[PDB]
């Protein structure tokens, strides 16, 4: 199984928790125009798009004999090997494959559009968190971020790009605390986080 | 004009982070403002815990019991709110209440006729699943969708008179904001900050704690 990373620090714990894995034998990252950080820092390099699928398209060349592929958002730092091992050990039962989410706990409102008012309260019942790694059979990833690119879907996650084309993936529970630094305070708590 | 502050009934606010109970800095966080003069605080009728707490001999605090349901505990909270004509809910386990977010919240009594509650957006991917299996059924739309938090601010007429129908006519009651929802009522939406969390697992406690400072 090979390992693509679309992209403080973050990547470099991103990266070592999907080669703190023996089944990921290599992690090919992938990094766009304009990016000197990366070379100070089973590592390939690749040269990203500018989608977030182009990217992990642009990764999918360098895989090799790799029939499943793994997805990692390169700012989540908090993931764990137990969810991790939960989600790869999936290439032996899944047809379409799937990817690692957190239920819902609170309850949650959709807004009236345009306006910030409370349309209706959100059912939390098979409600989940995206989450990363995403794991799917690699040529079947490549298949369905294609068409989804092309007849221009809108995409967020890999696991979107499947749904697009019909599929539906699977929901692996993991973690809450694995999560993503997205803000310049996500970082103190991803901190507290990912220190057991 | 005056606002009364009333919490609703394995829970977690008797627990303690430092010197004091989750439901305490809860509380606390709620007189804090003043216009908040008093707080009505609904326990279970088999919760004796509460009666051992310095917060009970407040000046500013009264308890009621409207049984386990938190529509009849928050009705019984209303009998009790004097004069108030505008009402905060909030929830007894929820330490981390900011001061920047209350205030924008009572704002609201001087803008819309429907009051508000706190909320935080969702940053991430949803998905839903399919009925009856760990499998996405689609991707949920985060545009407009929320976090709901507390406190809820609402007048207190409308508030009595929504969970009244809401309870006569079988509602599925979650919040108090959603008992407005189902009588035709869309309370505003005000954005506070996600750390305002509801301490209700163990892990939950040390983030409680690691908000609750600075």
């Not at 999936?90 to 345009?114: C, F, H, N, Q, W």
Request: charged share 25%; glycine share 6%; aromatic share 4%.
């Amino acid at each position: 199984v090979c390992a693509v990373v679309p992209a403080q620090t973050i990547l470099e714990h991103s990266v070592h928790a999907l080669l703190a894995h023996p089944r990921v034998k290599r992690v090919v990252i992938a990094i766009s125009p304009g990016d000197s950080r990366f070379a100070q820092l089973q590592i390939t390099v690749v040269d990203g798009g500018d989608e977030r699928a182009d990217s992990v398209l642009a990764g999918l060349k360098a895989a090799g004999d790799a029939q499943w592929v793994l997805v990692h958002d390169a700012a989540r730092p908090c993931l764990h090997q137990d969810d991790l091992a939960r989600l790869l050990a999936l290439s032996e039962t899944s047809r379409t494959g799937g990817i690692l989410a957190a239920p819902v706990r609170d309850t949650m409102k959709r807004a009236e559009p345009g306006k910030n008012a409370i349309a209706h309260t959100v059912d939390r019942n098979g409600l989940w968190h995206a989450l990363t790694p995403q794991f799917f059979p690699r040529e079947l990833l490549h298949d369905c971020l294609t068409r989804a690119l092309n007849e221009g879907a809108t995409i967020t996650d890999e696991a979107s790009a499947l749904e697009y084309c019909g599929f539906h993936p699977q929901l692996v529970e993991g973690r809450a605390d694995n999560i993503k630094v997205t803000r310049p305070e996500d970082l103190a708590l991803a901190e507290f986080y990912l220190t057991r």
